[PDB]
Amino acid sequence: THVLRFGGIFEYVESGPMGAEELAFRFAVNTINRNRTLLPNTTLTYDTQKINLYDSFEASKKACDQLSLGVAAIFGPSHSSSANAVQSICNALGVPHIQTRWKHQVSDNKDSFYVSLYPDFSSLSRAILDLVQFFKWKTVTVVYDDSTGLIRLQELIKAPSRYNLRLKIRQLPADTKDAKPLLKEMKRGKEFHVIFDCSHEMAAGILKQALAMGMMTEYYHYIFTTLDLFALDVEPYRYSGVNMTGFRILNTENTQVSSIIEKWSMERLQAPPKPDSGLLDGFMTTDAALMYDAVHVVSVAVQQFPQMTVSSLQCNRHKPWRFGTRFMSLIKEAHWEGLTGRITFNKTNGLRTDFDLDVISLKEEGLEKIGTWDPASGLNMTE
Amino acid sequence: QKINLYDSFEASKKACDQLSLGVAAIFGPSHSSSANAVQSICNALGVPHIQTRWKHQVSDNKDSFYVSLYPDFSSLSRAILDLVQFFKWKTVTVVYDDSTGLIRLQELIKAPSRYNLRLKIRQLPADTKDAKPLLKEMKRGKEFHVI
């Protein structure tokens, strides 16, 4: 019957195996094909290209090749520089660029052929601050990894002039093994209330150092910026009495979503897990649930545009895709219940600014839900 | 070659044209996204890319065919802090324009845990004409010392 091709560009270091993102992409396409409610008369196909991390030149070439083969959208690469380059190309040839990861939005940048499935920083920033205020903290130490961490917490950093929060800002070193000296200063400083802004792999690492340092006890409360908090091996810490609170956008309470995350673990967990990681093996991370959701949301849009077909476009020529403008518009209007909850983009900038978070905390039983957050309600804690 | 601001695609094309004419270096464009794209190209073809403006350095980025004549942020950050400490300020309000402002002052923002500076962080609005309400808060707040 009818057929439509998507492009995929996935970043990696060294060689195989496949990464979580490229895997979720493929997995979403195979699943949707078998669904008879979604794209009934339509069958999805794809080209996948692999590139080095941070080689925007290579990302450009591969994107141009794909636009030449003909594709209805490029689920372009993840990291800032390659992603900005594929986005500019996609904008010139009017093919939608689908992003899954946050990158810094420049105001005076006029690109309009992209949406981003990642929960925007502005909203996450607010939900961190909302949580802090609910715990009634007046003192807090924000610890971040790299520069862009600062930007994710700007709403929080600017609070000390409106509300009554004194706050200290510290930076992690490159390696978490180097983090004892920093933790010792916090300990002497009696900095019991701490927000860690950093990847979940950094967070697994910094917790081990915190245990070594006598800082996983009832005296300490840690808020985690990472959405992959639920991926942390928490077996070493749940008996200790520390408080760990963070957020989760992956909708694991829904039974339909749990069964999907499982089928994933079977084809994935089948491959390399690590012992000294401090992460659960075969948990579906957020980077990958978002890619899988992106392939669905875009498909909901394809259903509403049966006329559309792919064209072989050349980066040489300034001739855009006929159907681009209309397709991009359908994607931004789209609505979908996926692995990560309500998906809905912002009319204005195509950023995902409205979404639903579960709020999770460490109880002795493990990490469990204790409320919700959404930008219009603030917290809905269930005391 | 002249290009639009923020069109990294056009910057790529023009850089490729120039490498085709033949050039010993590209004094590539100023702004982050176009500059990163011309730098990646210059790195693949081993022609030096000469920059004049700061852009955020990613650690795990392996490009080596570029130098930047702009005074690095790390050093400027320190010199701001050095000056504040010479004026013996214990209170200071940092006012920044856009996100990347934060990064240029990180050395300063992390000082309140080592030295004795309490500090308040405020952001300007898009337009300075919109800035009276912000300045009124600083005035009521007795924020006399301001970066």
Side-chain angles (χ1 to χ4, degrees):
Chain A
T1 65
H2 183 235
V3 167
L4 199 61
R5 186 187 291 115
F6 291 154
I9 302 179
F10 307 99
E11 226 155 0
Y12 75 6
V13 180
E14 274 188 4
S15 309
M18 282 183 78
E21 258 141 355
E22 184 185 348
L23 262 175
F25 175 74
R26 284 175 175 266
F27 184 48
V29 168
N30 287 7
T31 289
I32 292 171
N33 276 339
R34 314 219 207 80
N35 206 257
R36 302 212 186 189
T37 283
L38 187 57
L39 301 186
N41 303 292
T42 329
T43 285
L44 296 180
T45 186
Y46 56 81
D47 188 65
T48 65
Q49 300 287 352
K50 295 172 153 102
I51 58 145
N52 199 342
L53 174 47
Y54 309 130
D55 195 349
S56 65
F57 188 38
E58 208 197 341
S60 289
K61 285 171 156 193
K62 297 299 170 68
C64 283
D65 292 343
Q66 295 198 128
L67 285 168
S68 184
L69 278 188
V71 290
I74 290 183
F75 295 72
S78 314
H79 283 63
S80 172
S81 54
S82 291
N84 280 333
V86 167
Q87 168 187 304
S88 197
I89 286 170
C90 282
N91 187 81
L93 279 49
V95 177
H97 182 212
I98 321 304
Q99 297 163 10
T100 48
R101 198 81 71 73
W102 182 89
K103 52 167 188 59
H104 195 230
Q105 289 300 151
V106 202
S107 323
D108 294 354
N109 176 278
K110 267 43 185 171
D111 292 330
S112 60
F113 279 82
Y114 70 91
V115 293
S116 184
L117 270 107
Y118 188 88
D120 194 57
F121 269 5
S122 56
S123 303
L124 285 177
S125 211
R126 202 223 158 190
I128 295 306
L129 178 59
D130 275 7
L131 183 69
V132 155
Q133 279 175 217
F134 163 87
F135 288 145
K136 292 181 174 50
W137 293 4
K138 296 173 186 180
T139 269
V140 62
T141 289
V142 177
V143 181
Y144 69 92
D145 48 4
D146 80 295
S147 300
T148 69
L150 283 184
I151 296 166
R152 183 208 295 249
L153 291 189
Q154 59 194 142
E155 300 313 315
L156 204 161
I157 287 187
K158 290 179 312 194
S161 305
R162 15 147 86 155
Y163 316 138
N164 190 33
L165 280 73
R166 283 178 309 288
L167 85 51
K168 311 176 154 184
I169 292 153
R170 308 194 179 257
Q171 192 182 0
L172 287 157
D175 197 354
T176 52
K177 297 177 169 243
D178 306 333
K180 275 168 196 125
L182 167 75
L183 284 169
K184 187 174 184 190
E185 284 182 61
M186 292 166 62
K187 210 191 179 183
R188 305 202 160 185
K190 286 150 164 181
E191 291 155 59
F192 297 126
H193 294 291
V194 179
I195 298 187
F196 283 117
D197 193 302
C198 65
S199 85
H200 71 295
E201 294 91 356
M202 289 284 290
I206 205 68
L207 291 186
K208 291 169 186 201
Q209 306 285 333
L211 180 70
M213 282 269 152
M215 293 177 65
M216 304 287 299
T217 82
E218 34 279 308
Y219 289 111
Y220 289 86
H221 196 158
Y222 295 112
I223 286 167
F224 282 94
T225 242
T226 175
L227 297 173
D228 283 319
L229 189 55
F230 203 55
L232 259 71
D233 185 10
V234 130
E235 191 62 30
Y237 313 112
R238 48 150 163 164
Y239 294 110
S240 71
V242 294
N243 278 121
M244 286 173 49
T245 311
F247 292 97
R248 176 187 58 202
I249 198 171
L250 193 58
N251 188 16
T252 52
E253 255 48 324
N254 175 285
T255 317
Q256 282 204 342
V257 172
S258 285
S259 52
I260 297 176
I261 291 180
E262 205 172 331
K263 301 167 200 156
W264 157 270
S265 298
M266 298 181 194
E267 318 172 357
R268 137 125 306 196
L269 216 179
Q270 184 198 351
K274 337 160 85 94
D276 207 358
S277 53
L279 295 326
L280 301 174
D281 296 340
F283 178 77
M284 189 174 216
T285 52
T286 290
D287 69 13
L290 291 179
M291 175 66 67
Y292 169 109
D293 266 355
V295 165
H296 278 80
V297 168
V298 163
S299 289
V300 163
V302 169
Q303 203 159 44
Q304 293 165 324
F305 204 171
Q307 306 87 280
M308 163 176 62
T309 66
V310 150
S311 296
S312 172
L313 301 161
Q314 298 297 131
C315 289
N316 280 344
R317 315 160 188 176
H318 314 155
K319 159 190 187 172
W321 187 37
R322 319 191 275 276
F323 303 119
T325 288
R326 161 77 170 149
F327 192 32
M328 199 62 237
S329 173
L330 282 168
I331 287 167
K332 293 194 195 186
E333 285 174 3
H335 276 48
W336 176 251
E337 297 289 327
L339 304 187
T340 65
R342 283 185 312 117
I343 304 179
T344 184
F345 311 101
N346 212 26
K347 264 202 171 344
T348 299
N349 48 41
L351 296 190
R352 196 181 172 181
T353 70
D354 182 27
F355 49 89
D356 289 346
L357 299 182
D358 283 318
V359 42
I360 55 166
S361 221
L362 182 73
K363 314 282 202 206
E364 186 175 314
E365 287 76 17
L367 283 163
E368 301 203 336
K369 175 171 159 211
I370 67 172
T372 52
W373 185 94
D374 64 58
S377 307
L379 297 162
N380 281 0
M381 310 296 287
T382 49
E383 301 133 337
Chain B
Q1 299 288 353
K2 293 172 154 102
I3 59 147
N4 200 342
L5 174 48
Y6 309 129
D7 195 348
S8 65
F9 188 40
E10 206 196 341
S12 291
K13 286 170 155 192
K14 297 301 169 66
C16 285
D17 293 341
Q18 296 197 125
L19 286 166
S20 186
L21 279 187
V23 292
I26 291 182
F27 295 72
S30 314
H31 282 63
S32 173
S33 54
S34 291
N36 278 333
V38 169
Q39 166 187 304
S40 199
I41 286 166
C42 281
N43 187 77
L45 277 48
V47 176
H49 183 212
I50 320 304
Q51 296 164 11
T52 48
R53 199 80 71 73
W54 182 89
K55 51 168 190 59
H56 195 230
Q57 289 300 150
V58 202
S59 323
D60 294 354
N61 176 276
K62 266 45 184 170
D63 293 331
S64 59
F65 277 84
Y66 70 91
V67 293
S68 184
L69 271 107
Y70 190 88
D72 194 57
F73 270 5
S74 56
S75 301
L76 284 177
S77 212
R78 202 222 157 191
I80 294 307
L81 180 59
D82 273 7
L83 183 69
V84 158
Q85 278 175 217
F86 163 87
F87 288 146
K88 292 181 173 49
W89 292 4
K90 297 174 185 180
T91 270
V92 62
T93 289
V94 177
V95 181
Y96 69 93
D97 48 3
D98 79 295
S99 300
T100 68
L102 284 184
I103 295 167
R104 183 208 296 249
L105 290 190
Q106 57 195 141
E107 299 313 315
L108 204 160
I109 289 188
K110 289 178 312 192
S113 305
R114 15 147 86 154
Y115 316 138
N116 190 33
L117 281 73
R118 283 178 309 288
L119 84 52
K120 311 176 154 184
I121 290 154
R122 305 195 182 258
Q123 193 181 357
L124 289 158
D127 197 354
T128 52
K129 299 181 168 234
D130 304 334
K132 275 168 196 125
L134 166 75
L135 284 167
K136 189 172 183 190
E137 286 182 59
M138 292 166 65
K139 208 191 182 189
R140 306 202 159 185
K142 288 150 163 181
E143 293 156 57
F144 296 126
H145 295 290
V146 178
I147 297 187

